Design an enzyme around this catalytic site. Sequence first.
Site, PDB file in Angstrom:
ATOM      1  N   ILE A  17       0.826  -1.196   0.000  1.00 21.06           N
ATOM      2  CA  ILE A  17       0.000   0.000   0.000  1.00 21.06           C
ATOM      3  C   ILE A  17       0.867   1.254   0.000  1.00 21.06           C
ATOM      4  O   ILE A  17       0.405   2.326   0.355  1.00 21.06           O
ATOM      5  CB  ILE A  17      -0.993   0.003   1.178  1.00 21.06           C
ATOM      6  CG1 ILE A  17      -0.242   0.040   2.515  1.00 21.06           C
ATOM      7  CG2 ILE A  17      -1.936  -1.199   1.088  1.00 21.06           C
ATOM      8  CD1 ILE A  17      -1.152   0.015   3.765  1.00 21.06           C
ATOM      9  N   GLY A  18       2.128   1.117  -0.386  1.00 23.51           N
ATOM     10  CA  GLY A  18       3.024   2.250  -0.538  1.00 23.51           C
ATOM     11  C   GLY A  18       4.426   1.984  -0.025  1.00 23.51           C
ATOM     12  O   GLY A  18       4.639   1.245   0.936  1.00 23.51           O
ATOM     13  N   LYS A  19       5.410   2.576  -0.698  1.00 28.16           N
ATOM     14  CA  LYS A  19       6.773   2.636  -0.181  1.00 28.16           C
ATOM     15  C   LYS A  19       6.854   3.900   0.660  1.00 28.16           C
ATOM     16  O   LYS A  19       6.707   5.007   0.134  1.00 28.16           O
ATOM     17  CB  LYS A  19       7.804   2.641  -1.310  1.00 28.16           C
ATOM     18  N   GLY A  20       7.038   3.737   1.964  1.00 27.57           N
ATOM     19  CA  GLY A  20       7.122   4.856   2.892  1.00 27.57           C
ATOM     20  C   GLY A  20       8.550   5.155   3.305  1.00 27.57           C
ATOM     21  O   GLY A  20       9.498   4.986   2.525  1.00 27.57           O
ATOM     22  N   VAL A  25       5.383  -0.761   2.667  1.00 24.70           N
ATOM     23  CA  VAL A  25       4.298  -0.956   3.617  1.00 24.70           C
ATOM     24  C   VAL A  25       3.223  -1.824   2.973  1.00 24.70           C
ATOM     25  O   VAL A  25       2.964  -1.751   1.764  1.00 24.70           O
ATOM     26  CB  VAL A  25       3.711   0.391   4.081  1.00 24.70           C
ATOM     27  CG1 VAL A  25       2.759   0.183   5.246  1.00 24.70           C
ATOM     28  CG2 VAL A  25       4.834   1.371   4.431  1.00 24.70           C
ATOM     29  N   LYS A  40       4.929  -2.179   8.012  1.00 19.68           N
ATOM     30  CA  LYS A  40       6.127  -1.631   7.392  1.00 19.68           C
ATOM     31  C   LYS A  40       7.298  -2.566   7.652  1.00 19.68           C
ATOM     32  O   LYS A  40       7.556  -2.949   8.797  1.00 19.68           O
ATOM     33  CB  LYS A  40       6.455  -0.223   7.907  1.00 19.68           C
ATOM     34  CG  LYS A  40       7.710   0.370   7.254  1.00 19.68           C
ATOM     35  CD  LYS A  40       7.967   1.748   7.745  1.00 19.68           C
ATOM     36  CE  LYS A  40       6.995   2.748   7.170  1.00 19.68           C
ATOM     37  NZ  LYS A  40       7.421   4.143   7.479  1.00 19.68           N
ATOM     38  N   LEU A  89      -5.822   2.136   8.057  1.00 17.34           N
ATOM     39  CA  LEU A  89      -6.858   3.124   7.803  1.00 17.34           C
ATOM     40  C   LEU A  89      -7.229   3.047   6.323  1.00 17.34           C
ATOM     41  O   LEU A  89      -6.391   3.326   5.456  1.00 17.34           O
ATOM     42  CB  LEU A  89      -6.366   4.517   8.214  1.00 17.34           C
ATOM     43  CG  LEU A  89      -6.155   4.602   9.735  1.00 17.34           C
ATOM     44  CD1 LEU A  89      -5.207   5.705  10.140  1.00 17.34           C
ATOM     45  CD2 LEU A  89      -7.481   4.786  10.457  1.00 17.34           C
ATOM     46  N   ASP A 131       5.982  16.728  10.970  1.00 17.95           N
ATOM     47  CA  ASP A 131       5.861  16.458   9.539  1.00 17.95           C
ATOM     48  C   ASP A 131       4.390  16.449   9.116  1.00 17.95           C
ATOM     49  O   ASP A 131       3.911  15.517   8.460  1.00 17.95           O
ATOM     50  CB  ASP A 131       6.570  15.158   9.167  1.00 17.95           C
ATOM     51  CG  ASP A 131       6.873  15.055   7.670  1.00 17.95           C
ATOM     52  OD1 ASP A 131       6.726  16.071   6.932  1.00 17.95           O
ATOM     53  OD2 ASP A 131       7.276  13.941   7.239  1.00 17.95           O
ATOM     54  N   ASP A 149       3.123   9.044  10.534  1.00 18.46           N
ATOM     55  CA  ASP A 149       4.474   9.342  10.041  1.00 18.46           C
ATOM     56  C   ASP A 149       5.103  10.549  10.731  1.00 18.46           C
ATOM     57  O   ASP A 149       5.479  11.521  10.079  1.00 18.46           O
ATOM     58  CB  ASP A 149       4.455   9.573   8.526  1.00 18.46           C
ATOM     59  CG  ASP A 149       4.261   8.302   7.738  1.00 18.46           C
ATOM     60  OD1 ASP A 149       5.246   7.554   7.573  1.00 18.46           O
ATOM     61  OD2 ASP A 149       3.121   8.051   7.291  1.00 18.46           O
TER      62      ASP A 149
HETATM   63  C1  SJX Z   1      -3.676   3.352   3.392  1.00 19.31           C
HETATM   64  N1  SJX Z   1      -3.837   3.261   4.826  1.00 19.31           N
HETATM   65  C2  SJX Z   1      -2.814   3.165   5.683  1.00 19.31           C
HETATM   66  N2  SJX Z   1      -3.121   2.836   6.950  1.00 19.31           N
HETATM   67  C3  SJX Z   1      -2.107   2.809   7.817  1.00 19.31           C
HETATM   68  C4  SJX Z   1      -0.789   3.093   7.448  1.00 19.31           C
HETATM   69  C5  SJX Z   1       0.351   3.121   8.311  1.00 19.31           C
HETATM   70  C6  SJX Z   1       1.591   3.404   7.855  1.00 19.31           C
HETATM   71  C7  SJX Z   1       2.755   3.551   8.765  1.00 19.31           C
HETATM   72  C8  SJX Z   1       3.282   4.821   8.995  1.00 19.31           C
HETATM   73  C9  SJX Z   1       4.447   4.981   9.724  1.00 19.31           C
HETATM   74  C10 SJX Z   1       5.124   3.884  10.251  1.00 19.31           C
HETATM   75  C11 SJX Z   1       6.363   4.059  11.054  1.00 19.31           C
HETATM   76  C12 SJX Z   1       6.360   3.948  12.441  1.00 19.31           C
HETATM   77  C13 SJX Z   1       7.563   4.030  13.116  1.00 19.31           C
HETATM   78  C14 SJX Z   1       8.730   4.217  12.401  1.00 19.31           C
HETATM   79  C15 SJX Z   1       8.664   4.325  11.012  1.00 19.31           C
HETATM   80  C16 SJX Z   1       9.901   4.490  10.179  1.00 19.31           C
HETATM   81  N3  SJX Z   1       7.496   4.260  10.345  1.00 19.31           N
HETATM   82  C17 SJX Z   1       4.595   2.612  10.029  1.00 19.31           C
HETATM   83  C18 SJX Z   1       3.420   2.458   9.317  1.00 19.31           C
HETATM   84 CL1  SJX Z   1       2.738   0.862   9.200  1.00 19.31          CL
HETATM   85  C19 SJX Z   1       1.798   3.647   6.427  1.00 19.31           C
HETATM   86  O1  SJX Z   1       2.897   3.822   5.918  1.00 19.31           O
HETATM   87  N4  SJX Z   1       0.678   3.654   5.619  1.00 19.31           N
HETATM   88  C20 SJX Z   1       0.894   3.940   4.199  1.00 19.31           C
HETATM   89  C21 SJX Z   1       0.633   5.392   3.859  1.00 19.31           C
HETATM   90  C22 SJX Z   1       1.593   6.354   4.545  1.00 19.31           C
HETATM   91  C23 SJX Z   1       1.295   7.792   4.180  1.00 19.31           C
HETATM   92  N5  SJX Z   1       2.283   8.717   4.741  1.00 19.31           N
HETATM   93  C24 SJX Z   1      -0.597   3.389   6.084  1.00 19.31           C
HETATM   94  N6  SJX Z   1      -1.592   3.434   5.193  1.00 19.31           N
END
Ligand code: SJX
Length: 266
Positions: A17-20, A25, A40, A89, A131, A149
């Site tokens: 669902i995306g490269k974060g 991820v 992730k 989400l 951020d 994030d």
């Molecule tokens: C589409 N719905 C959805 N629902 C939930 C998520 C949860 C995460 C996420 C965010 C941060 C960390 C995180 C926490 C601690 C440290 C680090 C380096 N990273 C982990 C996760 Cl799992 C996520 O990336 N996405 C993709 C979209 C991101 C947009 N910015 C999600 N997309």
Amino acid sequence: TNLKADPEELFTKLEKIGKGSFGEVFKGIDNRTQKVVAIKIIDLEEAEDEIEDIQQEITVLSQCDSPYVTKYYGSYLKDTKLWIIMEYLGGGSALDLLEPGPLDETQIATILREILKGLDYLHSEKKIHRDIKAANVLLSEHGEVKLADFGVATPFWMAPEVIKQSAYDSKADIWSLGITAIELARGEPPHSELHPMKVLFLIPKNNPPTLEGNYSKPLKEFVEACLNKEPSFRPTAKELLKHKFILRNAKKTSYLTELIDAHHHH
Ligand SMILES: CNc1ncc2cc(-c3ccc(-c4cccc(C)n4)cc3Cl)c(=O)n(CCCCN)c2n1
């Protein structure tokens, strides 16, 4: 952070669902409850220099318990991969909900109010998001709005005191909120057409961005209140939740399900 229990047995990994930040991820299933989770996976051998940043965002996410910050469920280590598990989400980011078309001031005021709530929670706990932007604001299937994030303890959303690497405070989030209001109205932050290194000196150099366009005065003043060069002159989030733009335009979060439905047909 759990190191004995195997995350490949504890979760069914599904589609990307995306490269974060640092890793890909995935939507995934929690085998204990069949709830959906976001997973992730960061290769640690392949990204050593930033481990302290990962560690920092993990700890600050674990200290939050708010309806407005995405839930953190724990992390795992298998071989050299760190698995980071968060609530999933299903509505996407606010940024994704911008693709279909342009937001009306109801949806904008509503997203901003919920952001202000999470900003208010974070700041009352002496925490700083660092951020704030539409790509880091996620919606549930039901239109709840949550922050994700967190930023490390692209410059387009940065407050000038943050760029002038001068230690800062919660008011940096208010500046980023202001830029995010512009992003919500126009689809993209100020200076978005320009090379990041040009932006790095424009933000401290130039006068604050303003919202140009056929938008209501209370919304323009919202942006102007957030986008003050001097941080101590910006409103608190608590103050901004009482702002006329929010109070007149912000409806119930449920109304945003229409906005997600458009993005899922599109
Ligand atoms: C589409 N719905 C959805 N629902 C939930 C998520 C949860 C995460 C996420 C965010 C941060 C960390 C995180 C926490 C601690 C440290 C680090 C380096 N990273 C982990 C996760 Cl799992 C996520 O990336 N996405 C993709 C979209 C991101 C947009 N910015 C999600 N997309």
